[PDB]
Subunit: 497 residues, 4 copies
């Protein structure tokens, strides 16, 4: 059946990235189900390590490892088996009492912290991947809009002329720093707490480095209390999500204002807009508002997690609040949605230029010209130009129609004196494109300057992608090593022992 | 007059670090007054840079720079002069209209963002210094308590034997990672947005690198929109404060429980306790609870800042919530207080050992011994030992009095079968010190293992202090370079122009 | 299969209320699925009202109403039909184009706000019911513990003697005020926004009172903008949940400390405790910590909702954050759990009395006796008694062994003078039960005073239950009236038109 | 000296209400200094009550009461005397040891909770007064704009025609419910905890009702634990502030969008706008953004307070976070500012009408007319009118120029069939004023309907003011009774004893 929301001005299908905003809530796993497959990997890595340490024989190890595959399969459809003690009991019912030996030297506490880290680790790479895709859309969009003159706003008022490319490279710089935040967090998430057992380690001679390496961790959470009590990485994950999403909310809000009926300086692609069941004229920025909704919602986990940490001791505690799958899923959906919003955004170039030329954002350049040309101080020139604007608005004179006569009157009105500048001086100062070209320093909207930022961002994106590929490959390599090791044990036992 | 709170069991004076918790609220500056001296430095750096760029003559520069000193002096007692436009107007009244030229190419927006960064930069070094002092107290305390056997808790229940040194090194590892968070944040705070002007740069040929260098920044916030709209570093500063303080709350809570009348395993130094105006018996953990109060309060700025960022566009906005001096001051007071709390904490070594030996935290080692000795699986041994405990509690038998007869009865009761272990096996398994010695892996409480962590932490603290000294010296060097440059201009003009 | 967590000291089954804490997360509905059945009721009420208004004929109404039952049935298994436009389209495919007439004068905006209110209304009655059950457990528990002498704490230090009944009646008074908060909120939730349509009403002659009455609302959200933009009730619902749960967290924390191995003044019923997979001695307060977890998590929705309201205009907005089913479900589970925790809590009466008699909580009465008997001011008596305690602790003298000689020495040591009180005066002042009996004013722990509070609370609980029964019956009556009306239309059309 | 910010387009002085936003931060009292005068009242009320109870003689009472005046005077300039134990010690140094008797039966705990309640009580009446003034401005503004046709927005897109009066009465209804929230809170704040002493009452025969009555409380916090541990009213105060301010943020945001350069449908009074130090054209909505800033900041205390309550037991705790004066001061400043913003807002009536007539907000009425006139279902009419809009936008045809030919083409294009409506039918459906007049039900924008809401709101405002006058007079009466009683004691002792 058709998408019944695609009626009237909501033509065609929702963009896939837009549809993600509708699907993640019902599709989200519980934390228990999301972490369960990582627990299964931990069982295997732990058992392999115990085998290397001689705590388990190869025969016992093979029996357990084969059982783990069988219980994993049962648990694919039986959710009751996805927490540890039910899982262990099912393993015991499957292979016998040797099942219990897989917990030697181990706790639910270090198992759980490690499993959640593995989950968050994968979700952090998933997030970094999405943020990179978002930055790619932003920078690649900017590269096409070096000449798209438009006003920048401060305090929701037209400030000065820039370009759309200039604006998008602000977002790129924001995302560059959020990627740093996420990679910095990744180094703290990707630490293995296994071997802490309950909170104090164990007398069993575990090799904590081997379990860590088998599970793709880059290091250990060393202190055993820190290994089970430590939760700051969960709080930090929630925070970076929240602050990253606050910037995504701000872009969404920016574009929503751009695409108001009143601004009309940009239009959402049809595939990122919805309509109204009652008002046929609506082209609703539903992608933007649902993206903002996720940003706002991300405040929740951050506060809950920090509240729970403020409520306890420096202990393992079952009262700690988690970062849950549905929260991350919402971030990914919003990030994907805004990636497509940016990619497909349709700027109204003509109206953007009209506002820049007509609505007085060029008055700074008029002021700077008076200082540069006649040498008066900035504050006196400012007062003259403000009077130019006040008078211009009163007389209905758009900025690009301000001439020598109006400027001289304002100078005389505020100063008693004329001012020695030409009509050409004023014309060039009020030309919004010349406003852009004159702003040619580092980080300023002149095409040459924005292009330099794009080049730099393109080189940084290459490093972003390389960092992600390296982190991902390290995990894939370890997971394959673990699988090989499991198979070796099971098969050697079957054929030779 | 005497400290009227030092009555009854609140003997002697408050520790200075404890007193800090009482003073910071009334003493805290407003953000305006805290940032004002940095604005004054920015005026000088900006003016020097304009002079290098030939935008100001040396004569104009000298006149302004001399005026800045005069207005700074007026503003020391006249708070109305500490915001920019009143300050500029006072400068104009002091030296004449040339005062206005100091704003060429500049805005309140990039001035304010830069000034707040300079404030937060200094406050971040102040915070890093305090966190290092806190970690030093923790590690140096741990070094004296390698042999201080005591129980670790999970879920506020006695879990297993550790040592006080082992526990403190959990905190050290937490603080190591919070110092990473803060240094990572410092690299983002210490970026100069000057030259962004209103939000789009300027046509004036500023040298943004020179202003940045004169003000001790390590780099630029490049994009001019990012330079004025960017606020994530403020949110991040608030977050690291909050998460760092949540760990400080947890230690404070831990110690508060240790020092309850019922636990009695540690006692606060008198200089960190208060008493009651009514109940003469009270030795109140007032340092701890006021430290937790600050931790809880630090949630506030984090939420307000993120809320404000979620509420706007990617613009300069006057609606953004700030991180205020009093919030940082509270963190410093709480950190200093807990530094002294830890340094002077008096553990009850005898009672710590008593609990470890008597209240069943050794049962894991009993369980592990059954697995290691008779080869049963962990789950069956666990069930036997649980019955040992249940029976022991019922009969009023402390853990260190559990013997062969009680263990065999439990084995028979739960299994129908005895178990082939000796009274010596049980004795050694129940010896809490042997529990500690057996836990000799990485991050575990055995003195050799905790000592290894202390050695590592001591080497890391040397690097922490070196990083702080280098960051501080860089700022001091730049501030002196700026002062030299100002004096050169003023004096050259006075004597030679 | 057995509950694999019920091993060792976790004997028997989890209490049903305890199990609720494990089930609500996987069982929680999405908001869409939770609100859908209320949307179906709204369709019927709206259509009936349109029929009364002559906007629909009885024949059209019957056709639609019969279709609504058919689509409702499809939607029981097809989740795609639970949002409005897909539902309407399925209705159109089921009965023809007349399906579209059910939206005359209506929007998704007032439909959605009304449906969510109906959901929250039912969930608020569900919550009030649970809070009443919680208060009933607290008061009925208190009634059995008028004589259960124990210490009250301030700042986690023993303060003065009370009774367990006295403590529980603090919770009762807290819950009384939270029930007021919830009933006050109910009056704002139970207002009907239908008729606001998109945000400005409609030219169709709706009878907004009839739709409201058919749906059990007690009044209208009058202004049509307020009807769709209004969200404060959602924020308020989240807040009362959060503050109510913060008090539940505090009781859970209180009991957790009571039931520490070190306090040992209360023990959780086995059916509300868990154990450890590794440490056989653990009787873990898992009901308490998971209850606190829900309290902490409830901060999340409150902050997200308020953030979203701070981010928008006074408009209908799709960016607003919702209060979701799983959040309320968590509150109900925690409230039920703590209801059973309180009901089945096992106080250690002997140890409670021991602490009261031995650990110096009686020193206030000693101080008051010196003031009352010899007329010295409170501050000088306080200083004497503090010295009594200091000396007593040093000499290992429990409070109930403090005698005339020790009190006189302290008086002489601090004053140079003895004090004219008898050994009987001191004995009676240090008798913890006499401490309780002397505290006989309003709200104080004397059995006569606590009994008076219980009587009052029992009368208030009768009114709580009456208020809930009346609110519930009003909704049941309206729902039956609506069902009758639907059937009348369908059947009259089938048989007579 | 002149207000140096009143330059260029920032003409005249800041409105006084606008200036409040600049002054409250530096002017805010600490909580200690704000509560101190209430503590002094409590000392007097407590001492008077002790005198009535015969615990103090009239002679002792007079001596203390006279001393309280002397220490109060010292404390006006010596901030160290504003906490209890220093104050008591200064009283002792002033009148002798009898000073200590004023604490008989009392604690810092019930003193502090009571003093903070008295502070919050007065601040709640101050807040209710400001909210009433805000509602008065809103309703009185609405009364002048029954005919000010303009579009209402949903999702920041033009939705349907309303009037400015209609919009303002949404705010009135919001404020009516926030006033209910505040008055409901007032009944819980205005409860006296005195007599709880430390947390368990006292053996002294206090008359808790007399102290409560002398201090203007309407009832007791009965249970003595609740009297000192109870804090929910602080959380609730913070919440109502936050949710009330979120609605104020939304109006501020709404007006900010109205007053963008692009909407230009309203203009702030000059006295509520600022300008830029660099951009002479700026008329900045600084009142609005600083008002939103306060709304966002109010999230902070709410989260800190709730966090602290989630962190402790149901005890008196010094870790609880307070609601501080500066937070309330910010709310009052923002409320006053927005009161003046609303009062002096200048709507652009001509442009408001232009948008309503031209930008397609009338399309719903076109759709409803097709349903009403030719009997097609709403969904098919909707699809036709959407095509009308799509075509109209493509051809540059403003809504008020849509005619029969365009509607028939759309009908044929989407249906293959024309539609039997007249040019007059279409004209009347597209007349934005007729859109308003047709929306004549309860809460809809027709002048008759908005006038009815204004009449109701005016009657409700009379009751709001009466409730405030009654609450205020009750406190003034009690304060005068207390002063009379103090004077009677002091003077009777001086002249007759
Ligand atoms: O387009 C949507 O996602 C939802 C719209 C609505 O329910 O109003
Ligand atoms: O779907 C609706 O009924 C309305 C949507 C809107 O407000 O645009
Ligand atoms: O010792 C203090 O800081 C405060 C105590 C109190 O006011 O209760
Ligand atoms: O200072 C008091 O009155 C009480 C303090 C306490 O609760 O310990
Ligand atoms: O289940 C465990 O492994 C441990 C639980 C605990 O810390 O008590
Ligand atoms: O500092 C500014 O940008 C403006 C402040 C104001 O007008 O309040
Ligand atoms: O005061 C300024 O420099 C700029 C203000 C603005 O962004 O409008
Ligand atoms: Na971490
Ligand atoms: Na940043
Ligand atoms: Na409401
Ligand atoms: Na309350």
């Amino acid at each position: 059946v058709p998408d019944a929301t695609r009626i009237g001005r909501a033509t065609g299908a929702k963009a896939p990235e837009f549809q993600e905003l509708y699907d993640f809530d019902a599709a989200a796993l519980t934390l228990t189900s999301a972490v369960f497959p990582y627990d299964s990997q931990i069982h295997r890595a732990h058992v392999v390590m115990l085998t290397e340490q001689g705590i388990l024989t190869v025969e016992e190890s093979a029996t357990i490892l084969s059982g783990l595959a069988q219980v994993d399969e049962l648990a694919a459809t039986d959710g009751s088996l996805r927490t540890y003690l039910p899982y262990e009991a099912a393993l015991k019912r499957t292979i016998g009492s040797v099942a219990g030996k897989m917990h030697i030297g181990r706790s639910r506490n270090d198992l759980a912290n490690a499993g959640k880290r593995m989950f968050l680790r994968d979700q952090l790479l998933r997030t970094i991947e999405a943020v990179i895709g978002y930055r790619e859309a932003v920078v690649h969009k900017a590269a096409d809009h070096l000449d798209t003159v438009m006003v920048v706003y401060t305090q929701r008022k037209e400030a000065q002329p820039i370009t759309l490319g200039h604006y998008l490279m602000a977002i790129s710089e924001n995302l560059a720093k959020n990627l740093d935040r996420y990679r910095e967090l990744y180094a703290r998430i990707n630490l293995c707490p296994l071997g802490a057992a309950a909170t104090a380690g164990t007398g069993w001679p575990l090799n904590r480095d081997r379990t860590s390496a088998l599970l793709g961790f880059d290091g250990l959470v060393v202190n055993s209390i820190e290994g089970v009590a430590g939760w700051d990485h969960v709080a930090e994950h929630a925070f970076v999500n929240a602050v990253f999403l606050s910037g995504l909310s701000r872009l969404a809000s920016e574009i929503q204002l751009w695409s108001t009926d009143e601004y009309q300086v940009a239009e959402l692609d049809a595939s990122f807009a919805g309509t109204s069941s009652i008002m046929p004229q609506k082209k609703n920025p539903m992608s933007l508002e649902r993206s903002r909704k996720a940003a706002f919602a991300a405040m929740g986990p951050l506060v809950g997690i920090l509240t729970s940490l403020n409520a306890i001791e420096y202990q393992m505690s079952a009262a700690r609040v988690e970062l849950e799958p549905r929260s991350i899923d919402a971030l990914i959906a919003a990030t994907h949605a805004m990636t497509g919003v940016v990619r497909t955004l349709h700027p109204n170039k003509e109206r953007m230029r009209q506002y820049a030329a007509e609505n007085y954002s060029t008055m700074t350049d008029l002021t700077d010209m008076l200082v540069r040309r006649v040498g008066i101080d900035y504050r006196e020139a400012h007062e003259i130009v403000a009077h130019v604007v006040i008078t211009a608005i009163e007389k209905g004179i758009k900025a690009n129609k301000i001439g020598l006569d109006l400027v001289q009157e304002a100078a005389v009105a505020q100063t008693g004196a004329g001012i020695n500048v030409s009509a050409d001086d004023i014309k060039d100062a009020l030309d919004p494109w010349q406003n852009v070209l004159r702003r040619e320093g580092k980080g300023m909207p002149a095409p040459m300057s924005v292009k330099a930022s794009i080049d730099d961002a393109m080189a940084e994106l290459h490093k972003d992608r390389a960092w992600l590929a390296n982190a991902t490959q390290a995990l894939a390599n370890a997971k394959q090593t673990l699988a090989d090791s499991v198979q070796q044990i099971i098969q050697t036992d079957r054929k030779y022992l």
